[PDB]
C-alpha cells in the first residue's frame, strides 16, 4: 500500500490498515476464533470475519498484539530495506511508517 | 463427500447438477448502478429484462 | 529535515528579547516557556544542572 | 477556475473536443440539463431553411481511466451568443477556461 | 505588481502573516507563509494501490 | 473548603451584525482565563454544535442521483448539492418531510418549499433549481433531520431503511452550524479594578442558531466534560462475556428470514410471533386457529422451515436467556 | 443525540509527585481542549505559597556575596524557589532563619511556625565552610497565582512559585473504541511539588475552569 508518516508512532512500530490487516491474518483470525468460542466451527469463523462483526476486530487487536510484521520498499540495496515492526490497527487503507527508519 | 452426503441429508439435498458464477461487485468497492446492457446472441431466447 | 530544524529551532542563541538571566532549576524553566513572560531562543541565561 | 493561471488554459478546453463551442453564433432558444438549442439569428444559411442548432452533450459517460467524464450548461436560456464560445461545459473547465 | 496586487484588496505585502495553532491557541514564533495555491488531486490514489 | 479567590464571566453585548454573523463578548474575565475559554469555546463551537442538515431526498421519475429531468438546466446532482445548504431550523422535532412542487418557467428557490408551521427557513431566496420550459414540472419530498458533526451517507451503508426504494437519494449532511469562529482578548476597561481582559469572540454562523442557545450549549457541553475531571475512581469494565450458546444461534433471527408470503408473514406478525423461536415451538394445532391462514398457508411455514433443518412446534423450554 | 462519557481511566503514580493519568473514551479535539484548559490551569491558575522576598543581614543586593558560606546570594535564592510552604490561613508570614556553624542549613534550622508547615525539611538551602560562619535571613511567604518573575532597603526580590506544578505535559493518542473510529484519549503527565498530590491538584484545576463558564449554563431538561 502506499505509505504515509506517522509521528505518534514509536520506533519499533507501523500503522498497519485495518481491512488491509484484516485480510492478511485471516488464517490467525480463523484459529483464535475457534479457539475462544464465538464460532462454532472453522466455516464459520470465514463467514463471520466476512461478515466483519465487531468482535473480529477485538480478536484481531489479540492476534496481532506481538506478531511482527516486516516491511519492504521497491529498491531494496542494503540490510535495511526490510525492517520488522509491531502491527498497529488504524482506521484507513494506507501503511504509516515511522519518520526515523 | 459421505459426511458432506451425510450434512445435506441431515438439512435438505436440493443437490442441483448446477454450479454458480454469478457477476458479483468485488469486496472493497460500492456505487449505485447507473446503466444495466444486455448483448444477446443472434439466435438465443432475448430475457424478460433484456 | 523537519526534526532536525526543530531541535536547531530549540537552540540558536539570541540575545535579549525577552531574554535575560533569570535562573531556575531545569524542568521548572518548562512552565516558564508555556507562561509567556519569557522568549525562547535567549539570551543567554543561567540555570542548574544535574 | 484556477486563481494563479496563465490565460493559456482558456485554449485548451476548447481546443479539445471535451467542450461543446457554438458552431454557429446567434441566440440561445432553449437551455436544458439534457441540451441546448440555440436560433441562428444573425445570418443563417444560404437558402431559407429553418435556422435552429442543437446540441445534444453528453452526460455521465465513463473515461478510459474510469473517470466521470459529464458536460454542463454553463449559458443560460434567452441569452445572447457568438459564433465560437462556451455554450455547455464539460468536466475539469469553467465556461472556456481549463480547471484541472 | 504582485506587491501592488497585496494592496487595493488589503494584505500584507511580504506574503507573511501571523498564526494561531488552534489547538493551544497560542501565536507561532515567526510569522508564516499563507495564500492559495492552485492544487490538484492526481490518479493513481488509494483503494486502487493497497 | 475555603481557599481561593476567582472571578465569573458574564454576557455582555452580543451584537447581531446580520442574520449569520454575530458577536458574543465576555467582559468579566481576568488575564489568563480570557486566553483560556478562548480555545476551549471555539473547539466546541466549530464542532460540538447542533443544527439540522438534509439526509433523504426522492424526486419523482428520478431513480439515481446520476439522471437528469426535462426542462430542469441544472442536473439532478447538482440540485442534491443546493440542497446540501438548505439554512433549515425546525422547532420541536427530529424529522421533518418538507414538500416542494414549482410547475412553470422560471427559478425554483426555496420559497417554493410548503411553508411549513414548524420549519423556519432562513433564506428562502436560496438557489435549487432552474425550469426551463412552462410545461416543466417537479415535486421533491425533502428529509431534514437533527444530530451532530459531518456523518455524510458513505456512513451509512445500509444501516437504515432495511427496504428503501430506488428514488430515495442519500446527500451528505454538514450539521454543524457555525462557519468559522475566532476571538480576540483585548484589555476590558471594566470600571472597576485596572488587570482585566474581556474575550470578545468574533462569529459566523447560518442563522440556523442563535448566539445565545449557542455559547450556552457549548459551555455546556464543557462543563459535562469536566465532570468526569472531579473524582478519579478509575473505574474498569467487567468484559467477560458467556462463551456457550445453550440453542441453535439461527432460533435469534426473525420471521422475515423465511421468505414466505405476504399473507403468512401478516399472520405471524398479528398472532405475536416476531422470532422463529416462537414458530419452531408452535403446534399445527395453534396454527389452525389463526385467523386467515389455511391449507396454502400452513403448507408454506413446515416447507420454509423444514428447508432450514428446523422442524415445526418443537419444544425448547429455554427462551430466552440471558442477558 | 448528545455526547458520551470517559468510561475507563487509569492512573499510576510514579511516586508521591510524579504521575500519570490516561482518559481513553473522548471525542474529536476534546483531549486537546481539555489539555490545554487543564495545562493552562495547572501552570498558574493554581495557588499554593513560595517565597517572594528574601532579606538578608549584611546582603542589600542580590549582586552581593556571603562570608562564611560556599553559595553566592544567587544561588541561595534559587534554592529558596524550591521552598515548598503550606500555609494553614493567611495571605501573608514572614520567617526567620538563624544557623550558624558547619554543614548543610536545611529547612529544619528555619523557626519552626505554627501556621506554616514545611514540606520538605531536608530541603537544602545554603552551605557554611568554617565554625565561624553564621547566616540570618527574613523570608517573606505570600500567597499569589501563578508564576511571579523579577518584573515585579535590603530587599532582595525572588522569582515567586504561586504554584505546586512543576511541570505539565500532555498527548493525543487515538483511542480504539469499539463503535466509533475518530476519538481521542487524553494522556496528562504531571510533575509537582509538595505542596498539593496530583490527585486533587488537576480535580482542584478543573474545579476552578468550573466556576468561570458556569453562569452560562441553567437547568431544567
Redesign the interface.
Known amino acids: 500500500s502506499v505509505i504515509t508518516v506517522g509521528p505518534y508512532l514509536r520506533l519499533h512500530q507501523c500503522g498497519l490498515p485495518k481491512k488491509m490487516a484484516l485480510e492478511l491474518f485471516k488464517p490467525f483470525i480463523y484459529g483464535k476464533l475457534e479457539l475462544r468460542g464465538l464460532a462454532t466451527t472453522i466455516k464459520a469463523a470465514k463467514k463471520m470475519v466476512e461478515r466483519e462483526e465487531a468482535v473480529v476486530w477485538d480478536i484481531l487487536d489479540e492476534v496481532i498484539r506481538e506478531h511482527p510484521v516486516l516491511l519492504n520498499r521497491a529498491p531494496t540495496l542494503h540490510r535495511l530495506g526490510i525492517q520488522a515492526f509491531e502491527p498497529v490497527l488504524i482506521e484507513g487503507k494506507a501503511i504509516q511508517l515511522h519518520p526515523l527508519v | 463427500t459421505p459426511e458432506e452426503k451425510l450434512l445435506r441429508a441431515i438439512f435438505g439435498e436440493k443437490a442441483s447438477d448446477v454450479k454458480d458464477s454469478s457477476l458479483r461487485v468485488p469486496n472493497g468497492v460500492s456505487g449505485t448502478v447507473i446503466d444495466v446492457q444486455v448483448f444477446t446472441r443472434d439466435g438465443v431466447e432475448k430475457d424478460k429484462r433484456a | 529535515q523537519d526534526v532536525v530544524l526543530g531541535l536547531y529551532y530549540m537552540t540558536r542563541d539570541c540575545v535579549n528579547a525577552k531574554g535575560e538571566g533569570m535562573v531556575l532549576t531545569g524542568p521548572k524553566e518548562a512552565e516558564r516557556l508555556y507562561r509567556s513572560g519569557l522568549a525562547s531562543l535567549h539570551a543567554r541565561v543561567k540555570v542548574r544542572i544535574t | 477556475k ?4 496563465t490565460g493559456m488554459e482558456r485554449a485548451v478546453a476548447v481546443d479539445s473536443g471535451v467542450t461543446a463551442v457554438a458552431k454557429r453564433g446567434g441566440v440561445v432558444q ?5 441540451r441546448i438549442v440555440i436560433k441562428v439569428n444573425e445570418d443563417e444559411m444560404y437558402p431559407g431553411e429553418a435556422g435552429i442548432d442543437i446540441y445534444n452533450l453528453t ?2 459517460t465513463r473515461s478510459n ?1 474510469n ?1 466521470c467524464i ?1 458536460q ?2 454553463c449559458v ?2 434567452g441569452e445572447p451568443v457568438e459564433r465560437g464560445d462556451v455554450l455547455a461545459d464539460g468536466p475539469s473547465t469553467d465556461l472556456g477556461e481549463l480547471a ?1 | 505588481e504582485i506587491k501592488e496586487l497585496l494592496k487595493l484588496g488589503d494584505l500584507p505585502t511580504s506574503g507573511q502573516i501571523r498564526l494561531y495553532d488552534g489547538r493551544t491557541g497560542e501565536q507561532f514564533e515567526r510569522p508564516v507563509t499563507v495564500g492559495y495555491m492552485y492544487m490538484l488531486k492526481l490518479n493513481h490514489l488509494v483503494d486502487d494501490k493497497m | 473548603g475555603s481557599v481561593t479567590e476567582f472571578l465569573k464571566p458574564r454576557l455582555v453585548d452580543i451584537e447581531q451584525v446580520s442574520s449569520t454573523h454575530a458577536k458574543v463578548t465576555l467582559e468579566p474575565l481576568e488575564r489568563g482565563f480570557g486566553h483560556t475559554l478562548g480555545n476551549a469555546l471555539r473547539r466546541i463551537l466549530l464542532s460540538s454544535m447542533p443544527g439540522c442538515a438534509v439526509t433523504e431526498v426522492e424526486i419523482d421519475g428520478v431513480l439515481h442521483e446520476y439522471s437528469t429531468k426535462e426542462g430542469v438546466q441544472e442536473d439532478i446532482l447538482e440540485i442534491l448539492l443546493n440542497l446540501k445548504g438548505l439554512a433549515v431550523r425546525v422547532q420541536g422535532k427530529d424529522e421533518v418531510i418538507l414538500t416542494l412542487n414549482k410547475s412553470g418557467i422560471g427559478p425554483v428557490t426555496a420559497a417554493d418549499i410548503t411553508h411549513d408551521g414548524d420549519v423556519e427557513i432562513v433564506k428562502p431566496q436560496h438557489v435549487i433549481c432552474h425550469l426551463t420550459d412552462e410545461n416543466a414540472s417537479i415535486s421533491m419530498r425533502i428529509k431534514v433531520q437533527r444530530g451532530r458533526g459531518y456523518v455524510p451517507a458513505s456512513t451509512r451503508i445500509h444501516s437504515e431503511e432495511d427496504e428503501r426504494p430506488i428514488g430515495r437519494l442519500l446527500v451528505d449532511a454538514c450539521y454543524s452550524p457555525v462557519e468559522r469562529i475566532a476571538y480576540n482578548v483585548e484589555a476590558a476597561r471594566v470600571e472597576q479594578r485596572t488587570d482585566l481582559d474581556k474575550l470578545v469572540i468574533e462569529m459566523e454562523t447560518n442563522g440556523t442558531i442563535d448566539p445565545e442557545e449557542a455559547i450556552r450549549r457549548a459551555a455546556t457541553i464543557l462543563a459535562e466534560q469536566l465532570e468526569a475531571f472531579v473524582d478519579l475512581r478509575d473505574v474498569r469494565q467487567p468484559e467477560v462475556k458467556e462463551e456457550k450458546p445453550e440453542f441453535d444461534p439461527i432460533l435469534l433471527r426473525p420471521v422475515d428470514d423465511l421468505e414466505l408470503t405476504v399473507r403468512s408473514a401478516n399472520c405471524l406478525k398479528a398472532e405475536a410471533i416476531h422470532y422463529i423461536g416462537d414458530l419452531v415451538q408452535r403446534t399445527e394445532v395453534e396454527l389452525l386457529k389463526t385467523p386467515n391462514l389455511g391449507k396454502k398457508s400452513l403448507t408454506e411455514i413446515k416447507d420454509v422451515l423444514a428447508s432450514r433443518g428446523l422442524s415445526l412446534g418443537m419444544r425448547l423450554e429455554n427462551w430466552p436467556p440471558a442477558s
Do not use: C, F, H, I
Open positions: 484556477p486563481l494563479v493561471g432553449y437551455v436544458d440539463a439534457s452526460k455521465y481511466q473517470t459529464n454542463m450548461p443560460s436560456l484541472l
